Amino acid sequence: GSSGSSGILVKNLPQDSNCQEVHDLLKDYDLKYCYVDRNKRTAFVTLLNGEQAQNAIQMFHQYSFRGKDLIVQLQPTDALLCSGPSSG
Numbered sequence: 715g716s717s718g719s720s721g722i723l724v725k726n727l728p729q730d731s732n733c734q735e736v737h738d739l740l741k742d743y744d745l746k747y748c749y750v751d752r753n754k755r756t757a758f759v760t761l762l763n764g765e766q767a768q769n770a771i772q773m774f775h776q777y778s779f780r781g782k783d784l785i786v787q788l789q790p791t792d793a794l795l796c797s798g799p800s801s802g
Contacts, residue, residue, distance in 0.1 A: 718764025721789035722771055724750075724757035728780040731755065739779070743770055758789075 724736060733748040736757050744762040751757065761767050767788065776783035 719767060719789055719791055720762060720764045721758070721760045721791060722767045723787040723789060724759060724784065725755070725787060726783060726785040727752075727755040727757060728782050730780070731757065733757065735779075739774070739777075739784075740770060743767075 727750075731750060731752070733750050736748055736750070736759060737745055740759060740761070743766045746760040746762065747758075748760075749758045761770065771786040771788065774784060775786045777786075
């Protein structure tokens, strides 16, 4: 277990939402790829490391953008872990 969840989901996007805007927004962090989906108003961003996201999420969560509250969440990237009773 070394690699982490390096990525975040950009939900609650405006009507004129675009990557050029997102990229600049997450300037502090290093972006690898960006996929804006107007149809579903969702932009998938791939940060450098996971730790960065864990923070960038809330740090940018409900952020001020076009009078809207940009909702940032974690990526689906999961290890198919239905449950985890192991010493739970």
